[PDB]
């Protein structure tokens, strides 16, 4: 089997992106952020409390047909942002572009928090990283992915994430008409749960490239590119009048600015970014100071490869017995 569904940006600076999923009998439809950072396919639902839903779509099990409580199993996440959600969990039936899961855990949402009642346009998170960070108990849960795993032609996904525009993710086989030129895969460590990777180094702009490991996780639902210090000071100095803010919370820019490219290495191949795609516009409505789409990972303990990085790819994530990550230019 094969499934292949198309991911629309949330807003107009591409802050995360929505996939149609079908849920339950008959089917509720709900837009999910599809997180190859996480592995729980969460849901606002009939049991979110009411104060904490502004505008989402909600599940509703009992109107579910297959429905059914997956007794005494609870969930609770914390992500990098600082967000959160808990609940409690139920098996229906979940699609993604055609491809149908039947017994997928879906985790009822109880309580969400702040980020998520004031995002209208997110009904949920569906995770795509590895089944051993699910954080349902007392019996962990897999991932919609590993459900589908064994049905589908191949045991892969891709991510193909528009610029300002909508893309596709795919289930089960590798679009060869949505790349240009080779894929060049490179091995993932799933020791931490994330599709884990090392690049081989990077360049700014038409600058030389600079070849060193650079350790980190392919995170569709990350924003923007992480990188070590040493990495994001050498980009923001091509940018006259860039600097670190920590009122704001990371490097800004001056909105008149052009921005340089930023290239990143798998293997001997190389992805570039586009200067454009590293403007997050201004820090508040109206201010000519914008936000830079590569920031620091100092003190987030691991490197992300989030959108603005792999919006500028065709990303395989495949899951064979080893793992790997594949990269093309589009």
Not at 15 to 27: E, R
Not at 29 to 47: A, H, Q
Not at 256 to 284: E, H, K, M, Q, W
């Amino acid at each position: 089997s094969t499934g292949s569904a198309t991911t629309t940006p949330i807003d107009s600076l591409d802050d995360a992106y929505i996939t149609p999923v079908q849920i339950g009998t008959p089917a509720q439809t709900l837009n999910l952020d599809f997180d190859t950072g996480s592995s729980d396919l969460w849901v606002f639902s009939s049991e979110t409390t009411a104060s904490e839903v502004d505008g989402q779509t909600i599940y509703t099990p009992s109107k579910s047909t297959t429905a059914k409580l997956l007794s005494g199993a609870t969930w609770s996440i914390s992500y990098g942002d600082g967000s959160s959600s808990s609940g409690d969990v139920y098996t229906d039936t979940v699609s993604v572009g055609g491809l149908t899961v039947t017994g997928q855990a879906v985790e009822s949402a109880k309580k969400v928090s702040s980020s998520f009642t004031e995002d209208s346009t997110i009904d949920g998170l569906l995770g795509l990283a590895f089944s051993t960070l699910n954080t349902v108990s007392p019996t962990q849960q897999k991932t919609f992915f590993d459900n589908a795993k064994a049905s589908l032609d191949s045991p892969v996904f891709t991510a193909d994430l528009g610029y300002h525009a909508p893309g596709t993710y795919n289930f089960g086989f590798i679009d060869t008409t949505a790349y240009t030129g080779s894929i060049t895969y490179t091995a993932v460590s799933t020791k931490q749960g994330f599709w884990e990777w090392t690049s081989t180094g990077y360049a700014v702009g038409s600058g030389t490239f600079k070849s060193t490991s650079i350790d980190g996780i392919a995170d569709t639902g990350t924003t923007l590119l992480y990188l070590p210090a040493t990495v994001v000071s050498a980009y923001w100095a091509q940018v006259s009048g860039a600097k670190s803010s920590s009122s704001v919370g990371g490097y800004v820019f001056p909105c008149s600015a052009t921005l340089p490219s930023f290239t990143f290495g798998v293997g001997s191949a190389r992805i570039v970014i586009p200067g454009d795609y590293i403007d997050f516009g201004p820090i508040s409505t109206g201010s000519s100071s914008c936000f830079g789409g590569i920031q620091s990972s100092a003190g987030i303990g691991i490197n992300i490869f989030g959108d603005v990085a792999l919006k500028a790819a065709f990303v395989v994530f495949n899951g064979a017995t080893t793992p790997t990550l594949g990269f093309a230019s589009k």
